[PDB]
Paper text:
Complex I (NADH:ubiquinone (UQ) oxidoreductase) is the first and the largest enzyme of the respiratory chain, catalysing the transfer of two electrons from NADH to UQ, coupled to the translocation of four protons across the bacterial or inner mitochondrial membrane. In bacterial complex I the 14 “core” subunits, necessary and sufficient for complex I function, are shared equally between the peripheral and membrane arms, together forming an L-shaped molecule. All known co-factors of complex I reside in the PA: the primary electron acceptor flavin-mononucleotide (FMN) is connected by the redox chain of seven Fe–S clusters to the quinone-binding site (Q-site) at the interface with the membrane domain. In this work we address this question by building and analyzing atomic structures of nine different conformational states of complex I, which were obtained by X-ray crystallography and single-particle cryo-EM.
Aureothin, pyridaben and piericidin A are the most potent inhibitors of T. thermophilus complex I, while rotenone is less effective than it is with mammalian enzyme. All Q-like ligands studied here display a similar pattern of interactions at the deepest end of the Q-cavity, with the headgroup about 12 Å away from cluster N2. A shared feature between all ligands bound in the Q-site is a hydrogen bond interaction of a ketone group from the quinone ring with the conserved and essential for complex I activity Y87416,36. In the case of aureothin, H384 stabilizes its outer ether group, while M516 interacts with the oxygen in the furanose ring. The distal nitrobenzene moiety is surrounded by both charged and nonpolar residues that, despite the lack of direct interaction, might form a suitable pocket for its accommodation. In these structures quinone-like compounds are bound in the main “deep” site within the cavity, where quinone can effectively accept electrons from cluster N2. Most dramatic changes are caused by DQ binding, whilst Q-like inhibitors alter complex I conformation consistently in a similar way but to a lesser degree, to states intermediate between CXIINT and CXIDQ. The overlap analysis (OA) (technique described below) shows that transitions from CXIINT structure to CXIAUT and CXIPYR involve relatively minor PA rotation component (mode 8), which is much stronger for CXIPIE structure and is accompanied in addition by a bending motion (mode 7) for CXIDQ structure.
Numbering used by the authors:
A (entry chain 6): 16 to 181
B (entry chain J): 1 to 160
C (entry chain N): 1 to 427
D (entry chain K): 1 to 95
E (entry chain A): 1 to 117
F (entry chain H): 2 to 354
G (entry chain 4): 26 to 205
Write the structure that this text describes.
Amino acid sequence: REGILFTTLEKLVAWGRSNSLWPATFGLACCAIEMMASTDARNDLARFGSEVFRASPRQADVMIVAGRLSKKMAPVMRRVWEQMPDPKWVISMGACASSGGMFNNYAIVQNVDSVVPVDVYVPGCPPRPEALIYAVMQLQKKVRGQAYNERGERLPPVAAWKRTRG
Amino acid sequence: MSLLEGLALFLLLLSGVLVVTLRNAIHAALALILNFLVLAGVYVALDARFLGFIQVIVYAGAIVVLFLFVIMLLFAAQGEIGFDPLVRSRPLAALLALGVAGILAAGLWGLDLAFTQDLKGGLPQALGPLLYGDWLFVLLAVGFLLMAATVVAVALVEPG
Amino acid sequence: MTLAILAVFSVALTLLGFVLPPQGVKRATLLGLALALASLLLTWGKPFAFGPYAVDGVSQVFTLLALLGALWTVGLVRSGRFEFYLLVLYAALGMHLLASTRHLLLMLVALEALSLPLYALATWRRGQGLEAALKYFLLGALAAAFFLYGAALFYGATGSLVLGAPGEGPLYALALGLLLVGLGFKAALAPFHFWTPDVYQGSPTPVVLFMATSVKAAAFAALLRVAAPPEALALLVALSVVVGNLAALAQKEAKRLLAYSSIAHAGYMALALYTGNAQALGFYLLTYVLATGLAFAVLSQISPDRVPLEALRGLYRKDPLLGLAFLVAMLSLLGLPPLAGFWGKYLAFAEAARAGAWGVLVLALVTSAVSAYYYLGLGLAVFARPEETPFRPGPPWARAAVVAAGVLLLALGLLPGLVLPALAAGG
Amino acid sequence: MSYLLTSALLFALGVYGVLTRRTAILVFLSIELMLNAANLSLVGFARAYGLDGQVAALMVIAVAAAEVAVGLGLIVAIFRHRESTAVDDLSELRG
Amino acid sequence: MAPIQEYVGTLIYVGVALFIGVAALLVGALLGPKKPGRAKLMPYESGNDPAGEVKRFPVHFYVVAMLFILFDVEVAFLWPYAVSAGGLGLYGFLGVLAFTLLLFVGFLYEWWKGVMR
Amino acid sequence: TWSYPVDPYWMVALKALLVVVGLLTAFAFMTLIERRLLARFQVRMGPNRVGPFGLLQPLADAIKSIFKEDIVVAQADRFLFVLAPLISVVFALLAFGLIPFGPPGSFFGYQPWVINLDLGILYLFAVSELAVYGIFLSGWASGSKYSLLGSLRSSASLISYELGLGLALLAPVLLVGSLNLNDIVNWQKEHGWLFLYAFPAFLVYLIASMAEAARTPFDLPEAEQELVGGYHTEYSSIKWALFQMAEYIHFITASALIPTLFLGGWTMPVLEVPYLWMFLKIAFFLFFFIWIRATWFRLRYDQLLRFGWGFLFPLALLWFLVTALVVALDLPRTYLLYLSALSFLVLLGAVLY
Amino acid sequence: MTLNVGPQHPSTHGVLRLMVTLSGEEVLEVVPHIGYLHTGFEKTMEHRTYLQNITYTPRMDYLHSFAHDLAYALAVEKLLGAVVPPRAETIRVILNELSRLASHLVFLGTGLLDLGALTPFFYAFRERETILDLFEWVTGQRFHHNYIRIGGVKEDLPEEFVPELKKLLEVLPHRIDEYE
Ligand SMILES: COc1oc([C@H]2C/C(=C/C(C)=C/c3ccc([N+](=O)[O-])cc3)CO2)c(C)c(=O)c1C
Ligand code: SF4
């Protein structure tokens, strides 16, 4: 039941969801190889709990927009997001995904917050694997309710909870 | 005895009703597997033990698995297509379904039998000297029959 | 120890077909069956039993007949599939095991061993052949279930599954009825006869030859072991003969009409079951097997898929010997003197009257007199004008075989005191 | 003895299936039920008459395996290219 | 041999395993956000038709299963000889060898024909 | 159960409950240890995170798995979708009692095992078929033929090697002549380590256990890297967790049966400790198996079927025929030691050509 | 079975859609659908100065990119008559063959993982990681490095580049022989 309504249990389930974040890769472009490199035997996101990698979308909570999001791929990825369980988070990786990037044209979605609800933004080209670790830790403390923005507000645990799906 | 005996018989009869009434082929075969489990339990209660284990292993494990393999290759679940319904046969069959029971019940009604033999459980330890021996001829006939069955099915499908 | 020969030949050829051409496998099957027939000849009067396998007059006679039909129908089959030969061998062994045993469960195993190849042998791939195969398979499995619950209730009546047990009252009667159901089904007895016309019509003609010889022989060989009461026997005979002949009147196709004729003849043969003579019945079935194999070899020379009644006509102008043999065969199947069909009919009727069943016998005789309608619409038709019909006038193999079969039919009609003295132990 | 009455009842149930069922597969399933009702009766009478009906039922299972194999091969051969296995679609052969 | 008590212990084993599994199902089902979506309930793969419209699957699985049923019958028949073996002597050994050779000939046929088909 | 006592039914229920929850903890921590051992294999290091040694990470995994919006996909069968994981879990949990962890009373008084049936291996075979049952049923229920074909692959291959399991388990029965595991283990106590007599069949048993999704056919398949597998790809919160749990329980039960049957179920020739040697052999086979998990490719289930059917099973039945000759004529048992030693020398020395 | 082996699923690396016209376990024919990454280099590059486009060039083939940088550079050098210093040419062939080794490593790691085993992905990747450091040494970037220029290269090699290169070149031959 949304992981809420108990002073202990919401902390417990936020702990669980935050540390057991199970990424759902959507490898698109050169950002995605910097996403793969964050798992090799020098700098691996294989410690916080992200060892296993559920390729199916029915089984994973974190979807990372990793690469330029060409428009012909916008709806498919959309449904990949809709093919996720509801307790799901989406990180926007790179400049091409966060904003239009340098490709400012007819072929690219100029901010992937358009098609999917973004949790964390991570600049870089591609954002260093260590920036990706920093973003997954950002999201870690965000879903515990331990995140505040520049304007002084604490941010909701799960983005994509505030959208009237349709 | 009767405490669990009634339960086993109710499960057997209800599973048969399912497998003959339900239109879902998958539900029918599943009810038949539940039936075989209940029946292997009844075998066990009947001091027939090894045969129950083979019943679960061979019948459930092997035969109806192939039933399921074919009907999942060939969907066939929505059977009511190309009906020629012949509605009158549905109750009428029940009549015959009763009849093929009644006469059997007549052969067994008023019949007292000696159900008293110390089988000591139907273990294969005692079934071996029967199988290889008094039944060895039937066993060899069955094995050859299985070889002929393989050859028949193989020559039968054999797309070329 | 002929069963050893059959098992050896079947199992060896099963692998050898991968190294041998279908023609070589065909010749090997011919050799094996002929050697099994010869072994039966040299063992005339040499009873041999190991377990439930028990060789008596019935075993020897009916297995000889089945091997005869198998050899004949192999003579015709030339298909480039060694399988279409192997099954024949298999069926032979199976039917052998059906007549040579008293164990009810071994009877069931033999029923399956002989019935499985017969479903597949009817697949010339014509859709009606498949329709027939499906009808056959489903009804045969139903009859196998009935026979099996009969064997179960038999074991309920006595501690053994071997026939010859004393037997109780109502439960023994019920068990015997549930055995007779499947056994007569295999023997084309009504009211279980529905499969026969459709299956005979859909299957290729040489397959129907093999059926109408060996199936009926082996089924009656298994039937004689049962101690069938005379009332159920009267029901089966009356229904079979009446419906068979009547519905055979209205038939337009040769094979379907002949299947109905085989129903009527199974009804006639079931009369020896009143006494269980097994000598007279051996002779009767010898004659019927010879004649029907002859007729269906000719029908195969006419058309495998289906043969209309007009096709039979004009055959004498086409082939003299074939027309003569078809006429003789029709008269013998009518049971007319001086043909062996008359001796078989007389022997069965004598056993039935000796049991004291009069109305049933008279009804069978009146209906057999009715049967002359189509028996004559077939036998005499040989001389009609040839209408449009595919005709392939065979090799010398089948011609000589047909000649020998017809000559033997008439010879055993004239002088039965030659072999019939030796259908018991065989002095 | 209640077990043998139940065997008869299952025989009747498989009969009701074979009559009522439209498709080959469900008919064959009903036949399997009939054969196993027979096997139950054989086990009972073996318990009564000394265990030979148990090996009998074993051979019955073997028989069911052989005829299941052959029936499924035949079913595939007829209704692989063909539509629904419904046998009422095959009425070429009439009396 | 073995007493019947072990068999009721087996039944209790099954009842306990089943009860705990249903308990895990209850835990999973009762605890959740519960926001269905149309696309979420769609089968898979990006718009429709993951497999979608396809012809019937290959028969090779039927072949494998039929092979398995016949040779599992073989194994069930071999077991009573496995337990009671020395009591059957060379005669029983030779009978079981013949049985095995027959079914192995069936295998040898199906193999020399092969099933890549 | 000639000589073995019977605990009261409540003790059977209690010990079954213990085995279930111990299998939970066991599969959780074995997933951890396999992760870390793979890490040691592939240089990288494991999760020195939430633990330290990882030993609170299974809690995070279980807590994530629940609350995960357990969804019933539309266009799916309402009943089988829900029913198949329960089947796969139930028929996986059981069949662990028979494995003896000690002589009677070595459970601090009552019974090392749960049940000691007269016919054990048949019970194992029967409940082992039911895992494939849940696999392919769940495949059908999902309403996605992409998983249907994966389920069909699973069932076909697992069924081929599952047939082979019988020809494997025949060999020791001819020697012992009993179908109760305790008698077999006591035989292995007397003469010693049954695989010494039947090493070839032992092989085809071991390899057969590899086909049951353990690894290296690896064409079960899983949804990854190929035609997606069955029994997953449509389950979200707990049912997928139940599939993973039951499959891993089957893994560890098989890796424990391999030493139990052929090798020395605990019953060590010396130092005779009840539980620890069984657990150490379980861990030994697990570590060799994880070596395999890391070190080898797939088989594509075509060569896997050809290898099982044409290669494993005729060889296993040949060994059965040899052992049946030896037992029926009963002349020595040492001849089997000699033949198995020669067979191993052949199956090994033929490698280094 | 016209099966939809969709974009990115299942594990079709390099998002690509496939309609496998296929009955059974064989393969009749695969109908491909591409364009799911169309970003517009051929068009965007028409609105960027020649100097800038060196920022657009490596990102097309993100694995072996210096070939893209070198192709663009050489074509423009010929078009306006630029002179390659010998040291610049030697450095350009160094970075070319090294990015080729890196692209090859990624290719074989992906091929092994795509169907089969997971382990040998890491070892090759290990070496790849080392290579990246070399690039980060001179260009300050892992890949997508904007280093090349029309005349030659941006600026000189650091003191620390060559010894690290010698280290990796001495360890590699045994590593490649091990993979083989
Ligand atoms: C494959 O190469 C490539 O991929 C991609 C995309 C797809 C992708 C898949 C997987 C399966 C990652 C993955 C790897 C390892 C694990 N693991 O758990 O070890 C998990 C997941 C990552 O980027 C792109 C774009 C590419 O262009 C090339 C050449
Ligand atoms: S931000 Fe840079 S690295 Fe990431 S997809 Fe865009 S071009 Fe590639």
